[PDB]
Write an enzyme that holds these catalytic residues in place. Sequence first.
Site: not given
Lengths: 46, 514, 95, 79, 43, 54, 227, 75, 58, 259
Positions: B61, B91, B126, B156-157, B240, B242, B244, B255, B290-291, B316, B319, B438
């Site tokens: 998942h 292009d 994960w 790829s990314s 982190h 990733e 954002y 926006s 923070h993780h 944030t 924003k 979890r």
Amino acid sequence: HYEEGPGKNLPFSVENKWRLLAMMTVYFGSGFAAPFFIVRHQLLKK
Amino acid sequence: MFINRWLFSTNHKDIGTLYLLFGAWAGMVGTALSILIRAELGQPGALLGDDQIYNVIVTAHAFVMIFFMVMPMMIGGFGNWLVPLMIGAPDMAFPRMNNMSFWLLPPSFLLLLASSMVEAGAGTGWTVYPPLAGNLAHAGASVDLTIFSLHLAGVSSILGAINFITTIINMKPPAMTQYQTPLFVWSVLITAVLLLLSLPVLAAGITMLLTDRNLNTTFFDPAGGGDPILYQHLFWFFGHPEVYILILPGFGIISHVVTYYSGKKEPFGYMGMVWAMMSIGFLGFIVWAHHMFTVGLDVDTRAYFTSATMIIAIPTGVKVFSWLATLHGGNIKWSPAMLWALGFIFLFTVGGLTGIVLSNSSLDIVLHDTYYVVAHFHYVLSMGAVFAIMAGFVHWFPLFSGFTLDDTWAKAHFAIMFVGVNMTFFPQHFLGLSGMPRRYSDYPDAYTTWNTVSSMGSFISLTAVLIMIFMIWEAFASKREVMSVSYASTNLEWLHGCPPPYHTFEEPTYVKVK
Amino acid sequence: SGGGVPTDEEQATGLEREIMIAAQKGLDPYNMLPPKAASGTKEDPNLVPSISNKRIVGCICEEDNCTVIWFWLHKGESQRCPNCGTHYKLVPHQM
Amino acid sequence: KIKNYKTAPFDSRFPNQNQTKNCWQNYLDFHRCEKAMTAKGGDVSVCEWYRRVYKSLCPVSWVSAWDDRIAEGTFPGKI
Amino acid sequence: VSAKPAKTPTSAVEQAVGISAIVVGFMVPAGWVLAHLESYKKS
Amino acid sequence: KVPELQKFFQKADGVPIHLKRGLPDQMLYRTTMALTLGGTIYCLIALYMASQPR
Amino acid sequence: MAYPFQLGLQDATSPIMEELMNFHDHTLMIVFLISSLVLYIISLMLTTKLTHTSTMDAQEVETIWTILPAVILIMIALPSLRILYMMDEINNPVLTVKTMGHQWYWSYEYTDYEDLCFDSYMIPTNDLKPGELRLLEVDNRVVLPMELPIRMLISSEDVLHSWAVPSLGLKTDAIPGRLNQATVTSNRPGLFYGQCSEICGSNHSFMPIVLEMVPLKYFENWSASMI
Amino acid sequence: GAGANTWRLLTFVLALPGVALCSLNCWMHAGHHERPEFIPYHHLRIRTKPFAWGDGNHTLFHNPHVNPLPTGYEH
Amino acid sequence: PTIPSRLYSLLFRRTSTFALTIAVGALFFERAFDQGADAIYEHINEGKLWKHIKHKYE
Amino acid sequence: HQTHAYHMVNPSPWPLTGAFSALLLTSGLVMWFHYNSITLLTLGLLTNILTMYQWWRDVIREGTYQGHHTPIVQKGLRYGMILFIVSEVFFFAGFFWAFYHSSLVPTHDLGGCWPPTGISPLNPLEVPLLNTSVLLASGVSITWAHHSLMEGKRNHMNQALLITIMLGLYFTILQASEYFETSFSISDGIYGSTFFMATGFHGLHVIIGSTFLIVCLLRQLKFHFTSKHHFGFEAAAWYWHFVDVVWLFLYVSIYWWGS
Ligand code: HEA
Ligand code: HEA
Ligand code: CUA
Ligand SMILES: [Cu+2]
Ligand SMILES: [Mg+2]
Ligand code: NA
Ligand SMILES: [Zn+2]
């Protein structure tokens, strides 16, 4: 020259509605039903 | 001809359409996986027997809908469909490399499915925390296939990020500077910068883990001098940024949706928005511990990291205040994209604020690895970025295909999806505050009721996604084309017609002389 | 030693060859430089070359602006940017 | 003496969260006492409390493994 | 985005059988797997 | 050797870039796609026998 | 120790985590205030009748927009560091207890003097004594005293566990090759429950931690009469 | 100085004579002492998996005279 | 101002400066060449010369 | 007809072919590690070698044989090369920071000493100083070749690039020699793991750089690089200076300091 237009920039056939419905439901149903088959195969394996 | 178009592609629009198809496929795959995960937590039981296969399902998942729904759809599909069209480029600068990134995605999907296929199973969450992911607790070929799936997705990314950065910086009209582009182009600018400045640490860490599993090294084995907290540091130093990545083109789409249907010719505080997004992209790299407020760090390190977490919290808020001030006195038209946008603003706001609650290390000591965390990020990801991507898809579906979705059916889809995802993710706040950890297939009795409620809410969301296919079928059941598009002057992407031809910008844009 | 390394006035072929040949005449027909002759006046519009009878025209019509006003420009009379007042006339004689 | 000892005190050397270096350095300087009073021929039980504190500090698996590596002469620690 | 009306009309009955076909095609393999797991556990 | 190769590669024929040489480019394209699809099918068969336990 | 329809935190025994509740209530004030503020703005300014689509001024509201979230976050962060620098004070460890997280179970070592260690398994559902709990019962409980600062030194063998009790506000990850020090203080006797808070494989949902805390005379009568 | 000639001189004076001098100096240093005593610490010469090539206990660039094996040296 | 121009100008252009360059280079070349050839000779004859076995017989 | 000054590419197959070759390589590693098979891995290797070969043969065909490479396309290429090079800078920074985390706070199973007890690293004065001299001499060589391209003298830059490739091959063969004659293996502790993993990716990257220099040399012998548009050797020099500064970081962090 390539063909451009509404529905002609898609890989799938657009002009027949019912075969489009059949192909989209089997494609999205195969995507939906893949993890069920995976989990039943690990249930059968163990 | 078919192979030379849809397999040998060298234009961004067809490749982006193929990202829409592949991302929709992976979205239904992960939707089914979420149906299983909520399916035996409705009633307390070992419906799947051992929870090793449950961890396999949860890992599947997480991986398929992080790296195979949201990143392909968002980054690849919306970048390849919109970034050349907004900036005026005909292009991308490197189209063959973009096509290689797209065609590298389905082998990554295939190896992830094959990783789930092997009888040991890659049931390790994960995060790929060793030596649970080592060669003694997960002794098999599954997690190696998971690592190689992450290799293919990361490569790829990275190639897509290289193409995105070079086509924003270089493939721009000459007298247009960097501060006249629309804000989605800025979003994918900082996004592709953070991909290219985050994914090498992930690739090095998982290459290190592969070498630890197979080539008998001891980077993560403490019996030979290793430390698993090195993997935690490297993984969340990737993760982190990733995070954002997963949120910032959602901000760009939101926006554009908010300034579009409100009638605003210009979003309020453009330089403030651009400063806030570069501030997020600059502060995303110094916050990752923070993780790891429960791993055993030094107290001065934890104080610095929670301070920097509030410093990443402020832009944030800038924003979201600029969003509520670019709604300022606008001719609002209640298209469903605004319904997705208002849902984004409110529910992303409450998820992020519960994140700020989780940010303080003293409370994160007791609220770590509970369903409060799951509620925070399932709010933010699972409906902030989700409602951003349905806002973008419903908004640009006349541009993408040519036909329109039914407004009544799309608003009904918003209602059923809203009720479903709120019922799914509201009571797990109380589950996590009560102390439910979890990754649990079965729970004690006192956590039952909210679990049951949330589980049936997931079924409601299942009904929602059904209507999705139905209404897109309804588009191809109606073939109703467009008269015209409102506010066409301030958006270049709508201005070549619905849908644009294969070769747009044969003669490029003309710029003001000044 | 030797010569051997060639000057790129001979090994330039194709699109590189005509852009170098035109650029050292000072003319850019392939949109590599910001154009000149800014005039929003009625009798003297902004002249923009074309190969078709339709082109994108973007107007950053006041300095240090967020949004570029994009609109199609067609062959014929010159009509302005729809919020500011800078004229634009298309001349389709650039191959 | 200090003893009538109850439980190992808070060492000012390691005030932070991780305390594996505390029992590591404690077992190390226990053996530093042991060869020090072996070399100078003094009383070996003057720093007797070092064994009490490293059995109070780090678990039985680690000290059993370390004593086994002493028993085969294969401990990388500085002794 | 202002839309032209439908070049092909869609009445109520084909919409109804389309949504019925979609839900039964999505739920018959999922309900086939979830309808019986005692056989898959070799019990 | 370059300027006659410039004159050759501006054929203005419509043949794509990977088949501009002609016969050996066609042969090399065929032998780099045929064994690639064979390797892909071999990989799927390999994963299928890897999935079923022994 | 949960109960059905619980919305808030698990109620207090340690002073550290009741101060965590006080800070939790204060940040709940903050999130309620700003969520109700954005809710009022969203329900307000989407419900207007007038329009204004001009090129409005920009640089006239940023001073409050910059300083006010900073003020809210610094009044958030002052009790954060205030209580963060209070769980790491000068320890007075009356008792040291080690634990080491075995493969889906725990072990506990009381070897400050008169060496004692035991392995705590799980009571199965079909082997339950009547009236007990599901997924929260252990045959060999962890016995601690009250009113005393006690240290837990945690470790593991291979996989990453996490020793976690939410009612006492303790959660630290059991890592191989690294023992972690976590203090605990209790003001009431009783039986306080917790579970694994790190994944450890194919029975990760099946290890509970139970802390029976009693006065000290029963510690002599218990540890003197256990081995 | 807008010239390749200073880099030509710097190659032919500093670079290539320097690499020749250090090559000859390493040939002076090309004397290796005898092998250490085989003491089997558990933090090295570990095998958490048999190797994927050949014997399963030999590394890729294994040399039998300086590189030990977890069984010991071999002759 | 380039390095070969100034190396010709202040070292090679005048004949007396040329001779000073040659003399100083001769002295430094004598020292470096003697060290290099002695090191090569003692490496080729490792353990064979008297200075390698001089320490055994004090 | 294209009016803008960008590159329009023909529909090419090797994106798909290269992606599936990467699938073959990953599955070949999986089945070699778990099932002892070589044939699929060698198939994946053969596929992506000829894929990369004729993809860059195509890129050469539009570059020097068709001339679609506009200066703005050259700016896009140099931007992409800079992005790729800072990608492996940050990759090797991840490897470096793993080494510093392992080194600065040693665990209790190493004895708390860097290097650990039982492993004897070679002192860096003889062989790794020679490696640093080789790569620095190669840096002066590629700078000489670049400035000979600036002036336009053929035989001098031919000699320079032969010297560069000869010292690159000399570097990799005597790095293989120090792999042969080291006192420890990749399974010999965290020091051996970190050192061999970092030097292994450095050796792989300098092999890629040597192959890229071989390709640009063979291109220049066929008279491809002109006096201004010679981006192949510019990318070669950038990759080679990257390899040089990375080797300086390995010399300081792994060899000289901490050992
Ligand atoms: C897009 C996804 C996303 C986003 C935006 C965020 C945003 C944030 N996240 Fe989160 N996070 C995740 C995804 C995300 N996170 C995931 C996926 C995990 C767990 C991974 C795993 O499972 O291991 C996680 C985990 C996670 C943890 C770990 C908890 C644990 O595992 O124990 C923490 C705690 O510090 C945290 C904090 C934050 C903070 C402080 C923000 C902030 O950026 C939020 C800011 C947002 C706002 C909307 C601000 C609101 C401000 C206003 C409305 C203005 C008014 C303000 C004032 C007046 C002050 N996140
Ligand atoms: C992309 C990120 C993402 C998203 C969207 C979701 C979405 C959901 N997640 Fe997920 N979740 C994670 C990321 C995500 N999750 C991660 C990272 C973990 C932790 C993994 C770990 O343990 O390490 C996790 C864990 C996790 C658990 C933990 C299991 C446990 O603790 O025992 C649970 C169960 O409640 C859960 C449930 C759900 C549910 C019910 C949804 C629902 O929102 C699902 C509904 C979503 C949709 C229906 C999407 C819409 C799709 C379409 C419309 C089709 C696409 C087509 C178009 C867009 C045109 N999630
Ligand atoms: Cu122990 Cu999870
Ligand atoms: Cu984070
Ligand atoms: Mg944890
Ligand atoms: Na269950
Ligand atoms: Zn204007």
